Design a binder for this molecule. Structure first.
Ligand SMILES: Nc1nc2c(ncn2[C@@H]2O[C@H](COP(=O)(O)OP(=O)(O)O)[C@@H](O)[C@H]2O)c(=O)[nH]1
Ligand SMILES: [Mg+2]
Lengths: 122, 102, 338, 209
RNA sequence: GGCUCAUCACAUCCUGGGGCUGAAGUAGGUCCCAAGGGUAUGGCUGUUCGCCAUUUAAAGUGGUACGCGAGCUGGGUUUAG
RNA sequence: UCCUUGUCGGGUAAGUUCCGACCUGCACGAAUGGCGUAAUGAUGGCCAGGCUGUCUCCACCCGAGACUCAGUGAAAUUGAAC
RNA sequence: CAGCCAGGAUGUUGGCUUAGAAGCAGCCAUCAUUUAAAGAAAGCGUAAUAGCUCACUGGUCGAGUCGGCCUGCGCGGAAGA
C-alpha cells in the first residue's frame, strides 16, 4: 500500500537509511504499490561513506508493507516499518550485499527470488 | 528427490566447465531453500551459456523451473529447480558478496 | 541487404521560436498589460547508431532532414513548445566530413552513442519580458536565433576487427565458405565478390572476431580497373591484416612481381595503412602436391622479402583453416585496444 | 439451456487440501416444478414456465390456484420461465432437480440487488469530491456543472446525476461453481451474488466462454 | 486559471485493418480507412503555455461565445488605503 | 539595460519564489534622510521537524434542517400562455 | 486494329572507357546485304554472356480501327464539431 511520495525504510547494506519513493510503476494511473513491485525512490538520508549518495534517484523493490500482503487462505503478513532494497536503474539487480529483516514468500511469484535467497529469516 | 537431484546437476554442470562448486546444507536455517550449490563462470558469455543449458535440460527433465533472474545482465543470475537452488556466478562479483554462510 | 552505398545529406536545425507582441483586452476594460510570452527552442539533430541498419540507402533517398521549428509565442503569456529533436538512425562505424576546411565530428565504435550534430536556434523574447516603468508599452521583441546548417559527408566504414585483402579470384569469398557463417557468392571469374559481405568466426564461448571481404584490384591510382580506392576506404580499423597469394594460378601469371606491386600500392593509399601488422597466407594448395607446394611457398617469402611463417591455407579444401584461426586469435587477445 | 430459481442463504468459504481458500455463496434450490410449456404453434417461442417454493393456501388467489391446478402442481412462492436451447423437450408437471449443474462448471446468476435508497451522485458513479476547504461554501458533494453555456440550451438525456440505487435486476457473468449438493438441495457458487438473504435468485449456465 | 461534470467532429496519440518502402526479422518512415475505448503523476509561476523529474499505449487536435460562479474557487485581473 | 526566467550553489528527484557572490553594474542617495541594527510584529515571501480526511478516497456514526403529518403562514418576479 | 500459331537471324563476341558491357553503364558516323517480313534496336537478369520480348511480317478469325479539335451534361479535386 505504498503510493507516490511515501517515506520508507531501507532493508539492505547498500548505504541508504531513510528513503522516499517518488514514482510507483505498473501502468497508467498506478495508484498504490503491493509487496512485489518496481518503485522509483529518491535517497534522503545515507551514510557519507556508503556506496550511494543523497539525492540519487533510482529503482527499488518493497519488501515489507505496513498494510501487509494477502495469503490465498485469508491471511495477512503485516509489518512495522515499510522497507525497500536498492536496485540499479538500468538493470534490475539489487545493490545491497545483505538484506536486513524477513522477506515474505510472496516475492517468489514476482520473480525476484534472489532477495529471498538472502535475508535468512523467513 | 533431495540427493538425487543434487547429484543430477553437479555432475552435468561440471561437464560444461563448472568450476569451484560448493555443496551447502541449509536445512534448519532457511524454510525456503534446501541446498545451496555454487557455480562459477569465466565471464558473461560462459555464465549465460550454462544458465540456458541448465534450464533447457530441466524442461526435458520433467520439473519446471519456477523463475530466472538474469536479464540483460550477467552480474548475478540464479535459477531454481524446486527444492534445490543452483547459483552460477563469475569470479569478479563473487567476492563482492559473501560466501558459504548464506 | 545485398548492396552498400554511401552519399551525403543536408541537415538543418530549426531556428528558435520567434517572440510575440500582444496586448490583453478584457470584455469590458480596453487597456491591459503587454500580454504575450516567449517562443520555443529549436529542435536539435542527434546522430545515433543503429545495429539493424547497415547501409546509407535511405540517405540517397532522402538528402534533406528538417528539424521541428520552434512554435511562435502566443497570447495569455504562452510559450511555444521546444521543437522535437530529430534522431537519425545510422550504421555503426560511420565517419562524417564537412566543407570549408571541415573535419570529422566523432568516430562511432559502439552502439548507443548519440552525437550532437546540429544545434537548433534558441527562442526569442516577448513584450512581457521587456516590462518596465518608463517604457510602459513594450512594442519590442527579439527575433529567434537562426538554426545551424551544415552539409555532412556520410562515410560508412565497417567494424572489421580482422581485415583481409588478397589476389583477384584467389578464393577470398571461398575463404568465407569455411567455418565462417557468411555466404558470399563464389565463382571462378575475377572479382567475383563486389559487395563487402563481412563474416564472423566463433571458435568458442567468450571469444569471437569478425572478418570482412574486400575484392582485389589492379595497380591504378585513379578509379581504373573497375575497382579501387572506394573499396579501400572500408579498411583502417582492422587490427590485423591478412594477405592472400595464389599458388600456381590455372591461367594467371605465377606470383613473382604482381605479389610485390600490391604491397607497393598499399603505401600510396593514404598513409600505408599506418604500417599495421600484415599476415601473409597462401591458397590453391590442394591443386598441387602438398610437399611440392612447401619449398616453393618459402621461396616466395624471400623473393618478396617476407620473413614470417608464410602460412599455407586451403580455403576450399578446408585443411589448415583452423590452424590460422588459432594463431590470429591469440594475437588478438594479447593486444587489446589501448 | 434452461436455468433454476433459488434463494440466497449466505456466504461461506471452502477449504481445499492444497490450501486454497475460495469464497462460496450458499444458494438454496428446491425441486423446480414446471407449470406450462410454450411452443412455436401457440405463441412463437419455446419456453417452459416453472415455479419453486411453497405458499400458504390462505392467500393463494383463485387465478393463481386455478393455474397451478391446471398443471397438477402445488403452489409456489414465485413464478418464472426459461428459454429452451432448440432441441430439448420437457413435459408439464415435471420437477427439475439440481444435478444438471454438476457439469456446467460456470453459472450465470441474476437477481434483485440490495436497495440503497436515493443515493448521491458521489455514490452512484463515484463522482470525485470537491475540496472541503480553501473557501468552499455549501458545496462539498454536489455534482456541480451539468451542462454547457447556452449552446445546448438544455441537459442531455442519460446524464449521470443523483438517483436511486438497488431494487433492479443485476447480472454477474460466469460465476465459477464449487460443489453441487443434491441430497440436501444446495447450490454452491464461488463469489458474491446480487441481492440479500432471503431474496429470490435466477441461476443459468454461463453463456460466455 | 483551478475543482466537479462532460459532449461533439476526425485534420488519429495508442490500440485495429491495410498500401508503398530505398520493408531480411525485430525495430522503422509516409499515406489511406477507422472516433468503440483509453488518453498521467509532481516542483516553478495565479497561471494558459512551457521547462524539468519519472511512468505507461498515448499522455491527441479543435468546437462548446476560446463549455461549465442561479455548481465551487477570488490565486491574476481587482474601486476605495 | 537584456537573454539562455541570468547561471552557477544551498533548498528539491524536478524550484519563473527565497538566500552572500561573480558582471556589461553606478539612479536613486545622504533629514522628500543613507548603511547596519538586538528586541518587537494577528506584517510580505521561502524552507524544515512532529502532526493530521487538505488529498489519493472517501466510509461510518452522532445531532439541526432537508422529507410526511397537524396548526399558523411570507418573499423577490409576473403583458398574456394550451 | 487488337488476338492466337511462328520468324526473330545474319559480316558480328561493333571500336575506344574497357577487369568484366557483346541491344540493353558511357559516342554515333547511325552503317546494308543477305532471303526479306525484322533495328550494330525501345524493356527483364546478371558482367557480358545464354534466355524472355518489342516495332515488323507470314497464316487464321472478318468489319471497323487509330487520336487530335470544338461543345452540352457528368466524375475526383470537396475534411468540423
Ligand atoms: N581447389 C581449390 N580451389 C579454390 C581454393 N580457394 C579458392 N578456390 C577457387 O577459386 C575460385 C574463385 O575464387 P574467388 O571467390 O573469385 O576469389 P577472388 O578472386 O579473391 O574474388 C572459386 O570458385 C574457388 O573454387 C582452394 O584452396 N582450392
Ligand atoms: Mg572472391
Amino acid at each position: 500500500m505504498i503510493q507516490e511520495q511515501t517515506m520508507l525504510n531501507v532493508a539492505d547494506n547498500s548505504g541508504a537509511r531513510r528513503v522516499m519513493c517518488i514514482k510507483v510503476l505498473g501502468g497508467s494511473h498506478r495508484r498504490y504499490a503491493g509487496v512485489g513491485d518496481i518503485i522509483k525512490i529518491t535517497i534522503k538520508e545515507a551514510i557519507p561513506r556508503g556506496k550511494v549518495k543523497k539525492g540519487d534517484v533510482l529503482k527499488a523493490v518493497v519488501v515489507r508493507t505496513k498494510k501487509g500482503v494477502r495469503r490465498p487462505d485469508g491471511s495477512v503478513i503485516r509489518f512495522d516499518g515499510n522497507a525497500c532494497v536498492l536496485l540499479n536503474n538500468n538493470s534490475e539487480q539489487p545493490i545491497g550485499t545483505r538484506i536486513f529483516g524477513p522477506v515474505t514468500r510472496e516475492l517468489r511469484s514476482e520473480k525476484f527470488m534472489k532477495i529471498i535467497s538472502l535475508a535468512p529469516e523467513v | 528427490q533431495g540427493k538425487a537431484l543434487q547429484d543430477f546437476v553437479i555432475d552435468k554442470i561440471d561437464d560444461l566447465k563448472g568450476q569451484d562448486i560448493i555443496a551447502l546444507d541449509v536445512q534448519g536455517k532457511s524454510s525456503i531453500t534446501d541446498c545451496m550449490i555454487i557455480c562459477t563462470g569465466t565471464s558473461s558469455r560462459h555464465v549465460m551459456s550454462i544458465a540456458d543449458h541448465v534450464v533447457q535440460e530441466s524442461r526435458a527433465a520433467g520439473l519446471l523451473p519456477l523463475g530466472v533472474e538474469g536479464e540483460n545482465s550477467a552480474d548475478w543470475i540464479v535459477v531454481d529447480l524446486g527444492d534445490v537452488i543452483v547459483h552460477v556466478m563469475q569470479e569478479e562479483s563473487r567476492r563482492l558478496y559473501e560466501l558459504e554462510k548464506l | 541487404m545485398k548492396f552498400v552505398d554511401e552519399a551525403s545529406i543536408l541537415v538543418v536545425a530549426g531556428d528558435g521560436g520567434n517572440g510575440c507582441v500582444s496586448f490583453r483586452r478584457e470584455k469590458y476594460i480596453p487597456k491591459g498589460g503587454p500580454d504575450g510570452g516567449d517562443g520555443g527552442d529549436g529542435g536539435d539533430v542527434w546522430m545515433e547508431a543503429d545495429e539493424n541498419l547497415n547501409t546509407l540507402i535511405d540517405y540517397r533517398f532522402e538528402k534533406s532532414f528538417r528539424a521541428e521549428r520552434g512554435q511562435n509565442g502566443a497570447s495569455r503569456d504562452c510559450t511555444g513548445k521546444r521543437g522535437k529533436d530529430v534522431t537519425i538512425k545510422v550504421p555503426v562505424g560511420t565517419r562524417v566530413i564537412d566543407q570549408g576546411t571541415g573535419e570529422t565530428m566523432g568516430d562511432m565504435t559502439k552502439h548507443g552513442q548519440r552525437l550532437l550534430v546540429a544545434k537548433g536556434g534558441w527562442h526569442g523574447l516577448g513584450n512581457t519580458r521587456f516590462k518596465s516603468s518608463v517604457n510602459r508599452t513594450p512594442r519590442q521583441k527579439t527575433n529567434g536565433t537562426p538554426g545551424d546548417k551544415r552539409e555532412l559527408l556520410l562515410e560508412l566504414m565497417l567494424l572489421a576487427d580482422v581485415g583481409m585483402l588478397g589476389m583477384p579470384n584467389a578464393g577470398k569469398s571461398t575463404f568465407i565458405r569455411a567455418v565462417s557463417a557468411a555466404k558470399p557468392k563464389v565463382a571462378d571469374y575475377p572479382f567475383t565478390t563486389l559487395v563487402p559481405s563481412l563474416g564472423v568466426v566463433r571458435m568458442d564461448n567468450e571469444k569471437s572476431f569478425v572478418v570482412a571481404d574486400i575484392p582485389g584490384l589492379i595497380e591504378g591510382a585513379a578509379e581504373g580497373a573497375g575497382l579501387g580506392i572506394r573499396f579501400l576506404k572500408h579498411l583502417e580499423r582492422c587490427r590485423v591484416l591478412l594477405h592472400l597469394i595464389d599458388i600456381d594460378p590455372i591461367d594467371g601469371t605465377d606470383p613473382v612481381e604482381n605479389a610485390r606491386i600490391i604491397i607497393s600500392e598499399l603505401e600510396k593509399y593514404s598513409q600505408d595503412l599506418a604500417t599495421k601488422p600484415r599476415w601473409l597466407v597462401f591458397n590453391k594448395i590442394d591443386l598441387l602436391d602438398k610437399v611440392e607446394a612447401e619449398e616453393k611457398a618459402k621461396a616466395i617469402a624471400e623473393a618478396l622479402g617476407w620473413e614470417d611463417k608464410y602460412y599455407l591455407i586451403s580455403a576450399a579444401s578446408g585443411l589448415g583453416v583452423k590452424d590460422l584461426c588459432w594463431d590470429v586469435m591469440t594475437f588478438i587477445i594479447e593486444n587489446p585496444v589501448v | 439451456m434452461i436455468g433454476l430459481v433459488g434463494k440466497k442463504v449466505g456466504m461461506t468459504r471452502i477449504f481445499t487440501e492444497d490450501g486454497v481458500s475460495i469464497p462460496v455463496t450458499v444458494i438454496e434450490v428446491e425441486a423446480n416444478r414446471v407449470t406450462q410449456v410454450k411452443d412455436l404453434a401457440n405463441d412463437g417461442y419455446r419456453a417452459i414456465q416453472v415455479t419453486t417454493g411453497a405458499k400458504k393456501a390462505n392467500r393463494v388467489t383463485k387465478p393463481e390456484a386455478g393455474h397451478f391446478a391446471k398443471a397438477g402442481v402445488e403452489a409456489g412462492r414465485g413464478l418464472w420461465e426459461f428459454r429452451l436451447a432448440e432441441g430439448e423437450e420437457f413435459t408439464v408437471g415435471q420437477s427439475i432437480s439440481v444435478e444438471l449443474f454438476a457439469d456446467v462448471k460456470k453459472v450465470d446468476v441474476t437477481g434483485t440487488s440490495k436497495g440503497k435508497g436515493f443515493a448521491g451522485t458521489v455514490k452512484r458513479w463515484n463522482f470525485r469530491t470537491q475540496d472541503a476547504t480553501h473557501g468552499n461554501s455549501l458545496s462539498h458533494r454536489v455534482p456541480g456543472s451539468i451542462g454547457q453555456n447556452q449552446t445546448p440550451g438544455k441537459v442531455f438525456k442519460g446524464k449521470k446525476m443523483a438517483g436511486q440505487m438497488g431494487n433492479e435486476r443485476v447480472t454477474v457473468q460466469s460465476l465459477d461453481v464449487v460443489r453441487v449438493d443434491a441430497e440436501r438441495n444446495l447450490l454452491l457458487v464461488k463469489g458474491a451474488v446480487p441481492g440479500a438473504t432471503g431474496s429470490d435468485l435466477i441461476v443459468k449456465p454461463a453463456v460466455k466462454a
